[PDB]
Design a protein around this nucleic acid. Structure first.
Ligand code: CL
Lengths: 65, 92, 56, 118, 93
DNA sequence: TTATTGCTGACAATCACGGAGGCGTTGATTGGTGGAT
DNA sequence: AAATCCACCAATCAACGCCTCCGTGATTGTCAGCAAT
């Protein structure tokens, strides 16, 4: 019948909606992982810049000592 | 869509107010109309937050949990935790 | 004078929606009408009144 | 703050009155069997108010039912809050100003600022 | 105020009625069971990936909190070392 | 090949829910007078 | 003195609630192949 065909195309659309989302999630994990890999390298440099800033001030204090 | 679809019936809101107060008290036509606008906004305010969250998850339907979540997001905890009780007795 | 930071976002989102919908309604006037429906406004006058304005 | 919003901007006897209402609202919701057909505010109009936003498309049967109860309480809470101002200024007539006064008390009614700026 | 800890039960899951009738032949029993495992296994992985999303989301938030703590401490160390050095300097003079 | 279980589509069958579309039937809408505040 | 304005009434009819048909999802079942072991 015509109703039966309305189910086929509706499921073919449902199966495409799952195929898109599983690909979308797999891509979203790769994006997040790259963004997160940038943030962890950013802070490590900021820690090193602050750590280096201490060594300057700390070696200056020992100079008076 | 009609013009007054954005509001609720004045008589209904006015009836709820009458009950909230003692029998000797009276309410101003101005106040009735004010309350009407406030309670009508209360719905539209919450619904807008629930809707924008729905359009992130890509869900066309708006269910009770989206309303309860929208209320705790906008700082209506007492309302959200109170209507959890009404939804939980409905769902079963 | 500080407004709730939780609500703030939505108050702005609504302020837009209130304005756009009001322009679509073309009800630039904030004033409410004296009555709504003709037939009920007509019937309100039709009905038999009393000495104190009460309907019979 | 789950029960922080119950008593905001209120002091002394005013808090106690509102708290007793919420505890009654809870008790009625917890115990009494609810006819989900019976409502003060009609469900049709609550759905229309919601659907007035073109952003909204489809709505569940639940959301209107939750708003109906959620509104009946919301009104009753404000109307009571507002009565304290009238009773404080020796008035037996609730005025737009008496509501406006109650709304300012709590930072919960910050969304209504556009509705009654006063 | 006082209120019991209520729990929202989940809305009834849509779908076809799960066949209660046992299959009469082992060849169709091993088939449905293996196809039940096909739908069980695939539908679970998309939920496990939504969990994998939150695992990285939460394992990064605690890392962010730890790095934003570690720099604030090493930010005070500089300001401490800066003024303390100031005190030893002008006392030498 | 033959023997054996998994997996893999592809279509079909239930089941739930949301809408819109009439069709009963209800209760919201509405204004003048008194007299308080 | 000044003013306003809200509670009284309940009868028509807009519209509220309700059921049916139509449309779109979900979830499951099964037949007929593949796919390694
Ligand atoms: Cl009820």
């Amino acid at each position: 019948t015509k109703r039966k065909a309305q189910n086929r195309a509706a499921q073919r659309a449902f199966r495409e909606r799952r195929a898109a989302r599983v690909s979308e999630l797999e891509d979203q994990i790769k994006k997040i992982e790259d963004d997160h890999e940038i943030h962890v390298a950013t802070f490590k440099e900021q820690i090193a810049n602050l750590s280096r800033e201490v060594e300057q001030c700390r070696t200056e204090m020992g100079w008076w000592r | 869509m009609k013009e007054q679809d954005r509001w609720l019936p004045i008589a209904n809101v006015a009836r709820i107010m009458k009950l909230a107060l003692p029998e000797n008290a009276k309410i101003a036509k101005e106040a009735k109309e004010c309350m009407q606008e406030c309670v009508s906004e209360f719905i539209s305010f919450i619904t807008s937050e629930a809707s924008e969250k729905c359009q992130q998850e890509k869900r066309k339907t708006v269910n009770g949990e989206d309303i309860l979540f929208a209320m705790t997001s906008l700082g209506f905890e007492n309302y959200a935790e109170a209507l959890k009780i009404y939804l939980s007795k409905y769902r079963e | 004078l500080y407004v709730n930071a939780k609500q703030f976002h939505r108050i702005l989102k609504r302020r837009v929606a209130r304005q756009k919908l009001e322009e679509q309604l073309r009800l630039t006037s904030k004033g409410r009408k004296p009555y709504l429906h003709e037939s009920r406004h007509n019937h309100a006058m039709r009905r038999p009144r009393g000495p104190g304005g009460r309907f019979l | 703050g789950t029960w922080a919003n119950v008593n905001q901007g209120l002091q002394g006897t005013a808090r106690d009155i509102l708290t007793t209402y919420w505890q009654h609202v809870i008790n009625h919701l917890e115990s009494d069997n609810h006819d989900y057909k019976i409502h003060q505010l009609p469900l049709a109009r609550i759905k229309k108010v919601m659907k007035a936003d073109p952003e909204v498309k489809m709505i569940s049967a639940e959301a209107p039912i939750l708003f109906a109860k959620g509104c009946d309480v919301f009104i009753t809470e404000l109307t009571m809050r507002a009565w304290i101002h009238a009773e404080d200024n020796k008035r037996r007539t609730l005025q737009r100003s008496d509501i406006a006064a109650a709304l300012s008390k709590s930072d919960m009614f910050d969304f209504l600022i556009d509705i009654v700026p006063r | 105020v006082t209120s019991k800890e209520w729990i929202i039960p989940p809305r009834p899951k849509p779908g076809r009625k799960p066949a209660t009738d046992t299959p009469p032949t082992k060849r169709k029993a091993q088939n449905r069971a293996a196809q039940r495992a096909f739908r069980e296994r695939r539908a679970a992985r998309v939920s496990e990936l939504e969990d994998q999303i939150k695992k990285i989301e939460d394992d990064h938030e605690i890392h962010v909190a730890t790095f934003k703590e570690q720099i604030a401490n090493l930010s005070r160390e500089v300001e401490q070392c800066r003024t303390e050095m100031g005190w030893w300097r002008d006392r030498s003079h």
